């Protein structure tokens, strides 16, 4: 409210803040002395917080040198003295726990119990240098140090440091936004190198971001980020998953679709998140707890799982190797392996075991690792085309889209959203389509009882089941089940691991199928995947030359059939000759098969024409044939090969330019930001950070609604509608205030 | 300076100081470096040529093993794929070298129930090995030019 | 060549519109604005 | 890094780098934290001297 932010800067509250700033600093200073009022210093800095966020959202909507940020710049001016101090206290508690965990501080510590005198504390405070000794005694009397003198200083440095990071990330938050909004009031840098410790802290926590405002010009957003949250970003497979969305979308992507796509994809990591949490390593219960760890371990293991059963085949083969046959036992032959020790055989058996055991615990973790992702897009994609498309209201299925015929299942499915997190898109687009399509037939479809639903919200209804395995059986939705199996089947993974399985079983069989599993290298290894992607990129134009290869070489048979055809005896012996073309079926096996095998062609293998009436149309016909079939056909094949290196390698290298070149956001050249130094790289780390941008929008899933800034709310409502109006295009804070900025 | 060493034992050693030309000359450096810089996905091709024999091996000795013999005396024959071992080494090595393939080098198997499968094992090497791989090596050489 | 031709096309084809010949960038300086442009603006099916 | 943790305790170290006091400014730098006679044992330089 741009009127009541006015009013209140022209309010005395100003004077207020600074009787608060005041009185909490003093305060502060005076109840760190002793540990009983920690209670009371915690409330304090809850309320310094509270007065932390007043002050943001009266900046909220200012633009640079904006006279309210200006006039808090003269508050915090005229309180400077409690700011400092404040700011003092803060980085004082962030050097003791760093120097409490510096080994120099250990060696100074000579007591077994681990305690520290208060000679020994100020000796090695004054040893590090960084507190005067004003503030090591302040330090000593916070410390409660029993008669003995001794002080424990791990409680002593863990107290403080829990309470004051709220206030502290805000407090850097604030000035961060005021030095932005500010670029030039010295006060506001010496406040800054004050609270550099603060703020280098709190600066990986902090997150960026810019969106486009309600109020039609560009607006900048700091918000809080959890270490959990960060280290889950960092983890390795979520930055592969990020190199594919990045390579797909660059490839392949659209402008309109990309951020929405952006939005898909930062919503599968927090699902995959989630996942890798409760994986996470911290009677019938026992009993299930300990599947559940074993499933677990699975899951967590199971790329290590995949990496094992390749060596076991590996083995396998290796001691296939030296498998032999003969007539002799140790008319049917005999197959036994030939080999002094006599320690394979055995082993042979013991591994085959093995790797099918490995093969169906890798079913297992695939499962349980990656299906729960599958189900949760085709739902999320279900209920996003019901909730805005109607297609099964309105549009229905091509009914060329098995996707879409299976997905009618499902509807009815009371379970239906079970990985998807809203369970409420049922209600949503009842009342949203239920006006037009009948209230009952949305009902009908979605197996949902409108009595059942008004019941539920006029009453609080607890029909606790007792605990069951036959009750868990009743409640077992059959048709949830098939539906869910069908995606699995479809889905190509679980196709080739149970491929895997199969290959496996009949190895046990016979051994010799175990050579199969040997293929999975391909998919092991992506030197494999690149090289038959190569070919894969050009299969369809592959086949289609072998297709012309065949015609050619019919014709060609077509005229050795009625002309030529004397010349194909490829017996010596004249009492029984064997002509090939005698029947157009030998013929045209015979040319495809040893001419095209022939470097020379098909007149390497039949019977030179010299001193014959036809001998010039024959040997026309061979060089022809060599031409056409042995030379260019192949010369074709070899071209779409080089075509697929070179067309893969050019997506690359486009890819990975085209994102150091421009800013997946904005879309901005990197010349305009680098026109200031660093630029690109700042406003893409900073100003601009896709990380950032998930960072937010989980921090905003976790948040309370009440607690939404006009900002967040905004963005919230957006990201409820599906709009993505707010991410900033063809616009940044620089060049929005770029005049101002200079 | 071991390479001259031991040159001085025996002076055949001396050859192999004629691979400096590589160093000296920057257009060798080029040319070899082309090949250095695909090495990786050249030695990756290799083993999957190593694979793809094995599996043709394997065919060959459970169903197409009669047609190894490579001896024209029939009292003395010599088969090749009564061993998995012998099997290997022969489709790596001849077959491998020759253009048509392995049915060059094994006996037409014309007349006889398992003909056609033959004739679609001997075709599909040709394509597979013969021809796509090496077309492979190629491919990376001149994307390593490019 | 033929596959640098029709990427050629497809590139130029989306970057620049086929009327005025102005680049995707200044239009997409406002959100969007290549596509209006092509779809609204510079339409050579609305011109036919 | 392995083989580099040897050098530190050389006296002739930055023989062929211009810059002899390395020792002196990394030790005037972090001793404040690490202890001036842990930097004094891992350089091989004797204060008193
Ligand atoms: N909006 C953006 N967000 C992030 N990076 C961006 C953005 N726009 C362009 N970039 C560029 O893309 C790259 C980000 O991907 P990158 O491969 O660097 O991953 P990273 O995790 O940032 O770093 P690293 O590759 O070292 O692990 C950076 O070079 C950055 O300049
Ligand atoms: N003056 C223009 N008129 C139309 N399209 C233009 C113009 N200038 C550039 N374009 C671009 O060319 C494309 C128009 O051809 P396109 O292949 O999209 O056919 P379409 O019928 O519009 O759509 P689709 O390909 O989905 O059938 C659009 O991407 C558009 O951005
Ligand atoms: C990805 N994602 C969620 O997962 C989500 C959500 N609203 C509730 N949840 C479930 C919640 O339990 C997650 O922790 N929104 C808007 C969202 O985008
Ligand atoms: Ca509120
Ligand atoms: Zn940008
Ligand atoms: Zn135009």
Redesign the interface.
């Known amino acids: 409210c741009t009127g009541n932010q006015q009013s209140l800067a022209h309010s005395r509250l100003w004077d207020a803040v600074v009787g608060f700033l005041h009185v909490f600093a003093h305060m502060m200073m005076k109840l760190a002395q002793d540990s009983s009022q920690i209670e009371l210093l915690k409330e304090l800095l809850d309320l310094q917080k509270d007065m932390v966020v007043m002050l943001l959202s009266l900046l909220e909507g200012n633009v640079v040198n904006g006279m309210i940020a200006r006039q808090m710049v003269d508050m915090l001016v005229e309180s400077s003295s409690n700011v400092e101090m404040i700011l003092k206290f803060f980085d004082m508690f962030l050097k003791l726990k760093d120097i409490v965990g510096?080994?120099?501080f250990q060696?100074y510590v000579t007591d077994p119990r681990g305690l520290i005198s208060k000679k020994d504390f100020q000796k090695a405070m004054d040893?590090?240098?960084?507190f005067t000794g004003p503030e090591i005694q302040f330090l000593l009397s916070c410390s409660e140090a029993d008669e003995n003198e001794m002080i424990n200083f791990e409680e002593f440095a863990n107290r403080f440091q829990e309470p004051a990071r709220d206030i502290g990330f805000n407090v850097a938050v604030l000035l961060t936004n005021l030095s932005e909004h500010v670029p030039h009031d010295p006060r506001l840098r010496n406040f800054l190198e004050l609270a550099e410790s603060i703020l280098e802290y709190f600066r990986p926590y902090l997150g960026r971001i810019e969106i486009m405002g309600a109020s039609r010009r560009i607006e900048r957003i700091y918000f809080e980020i959890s270490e959990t949250n960060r280290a889950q970003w960092e983890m390795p497979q979520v930055k592969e998953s990020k190199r594919q969305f990045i390579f797909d979308v660059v490839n392949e992507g659209g402008?309109?679709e990309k951020m929405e796509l952006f939005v898909s994809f930062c919503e599968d990591t927090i699902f995959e998140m989630q996942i890798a949490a409760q994986i996470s390593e911290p009677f019938w219960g026992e009993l299930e707890v300990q599947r559940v760890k074993f499933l677990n371990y699975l899951s967590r293991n199971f790329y290590t799982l995949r990496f094992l059963a390749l060596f076991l085949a590996f083995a396998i083969?290796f001691i296939?190797?030296?498998?032999?046959?003969?007539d002799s036992p140790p008319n049917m032959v005999y197959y036994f392996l030939?080999e002094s020790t006599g320690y394979m055989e055995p082993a042979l058996w013991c591994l085959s075991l093995l790797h099918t055991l490995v093969a169906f615990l890798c079913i297992i973790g695939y499962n349980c690792l990656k299906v729960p992702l599958v189900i949760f897009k085709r739902e999320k994609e279900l209920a996003r085309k019901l909730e805005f498309d109607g297609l099964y209201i309105t549009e229905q299925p091509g009914d060329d889209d098995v996707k879409g015929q299976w997905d009618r299942l499902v509807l009815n499915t009371p379970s239906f959203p079970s990985n998807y997190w809203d369970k409420f898109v049922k209600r949503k687009v009842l009342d949203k389509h239920g006006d037009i399509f009948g209230r009952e037939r949305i009902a009908e479809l979605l197996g949902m009882d409108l009595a059942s639903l008004e019941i539920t919200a006029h009453n609080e209804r607890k029909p606790d089941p007792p605990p069951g395995l036959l009750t868990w059986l009743m409640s077992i939705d059959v048709k949830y089940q098939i539906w869910k199996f069908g995606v699995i089947f479809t889905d190509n993974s679980f196709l080739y691991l149970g491929w895997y399985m199969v290959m496996s079983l009949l190895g046990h069989y016979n051994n010799?199928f175990f050579?199969?599993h040997?293929?999975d290298?391909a998919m092991g290894?992506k030197?494999?995947r690149?090289?038959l992607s190569?070919?894969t990129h050009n299969g369809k134009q592959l086949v289609m030359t072998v297709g012309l290869l065949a015609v050619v070489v019919y014709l060609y048979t077509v005229v050795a059939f009625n002309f030529f055809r004397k010349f194909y005896n490829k017996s010596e012996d004249e009492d029984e000759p064997?002509m090939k073309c005698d029947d157009m079926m030998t013929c045209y096996?015979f040319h495809?098969?040893?001419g095209?095998?022939?470097?020379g062609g098909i007149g390497d293998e039949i019977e030179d024409p010299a001193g014959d009436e036809y001998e010039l149309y024959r040997v026309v016909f061979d060089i022809t044939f060599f031409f056409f079939v042995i030379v260019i056909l192949?010369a074709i094949?070899?071209g779409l090969?080089?075509?697929?290196?070179?067309?893969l390698?050019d997506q690359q290298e486009q890819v990975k330019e085209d994102m150091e070149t421009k800013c997946f956001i904005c879309?901005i050249?990197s010349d305009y930001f680098d026109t200031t130094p660093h630029g690109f790289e700042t406003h893409t780390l900073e100003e601009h950070n896709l990380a950032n941008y998930m960072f937010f929008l989980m921090y905003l899933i976790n948040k309370d609604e009440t607690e939404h800034t006009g900002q967040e709310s905004y963005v919230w409502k957006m990201y409820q509608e599906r709009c993505w109006?707010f991410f900033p295009?063809?616009?940044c804070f620089r060049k929005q205030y770029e005049d101002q900025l200079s």
């Open positions: 510096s080994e120099a060696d040893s590090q240098k960084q402008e309109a083969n296939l190797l030296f498998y032999k046959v003969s030939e010799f050579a199969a040997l293929l290298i290894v030197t494999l690149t090289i190569s070919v064997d096996l495809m098969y040893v095209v095998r022939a470097g192949l094949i070899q090969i080089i075509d697929a290196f070179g067309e390698r879309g050249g109006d295009a063809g616009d």
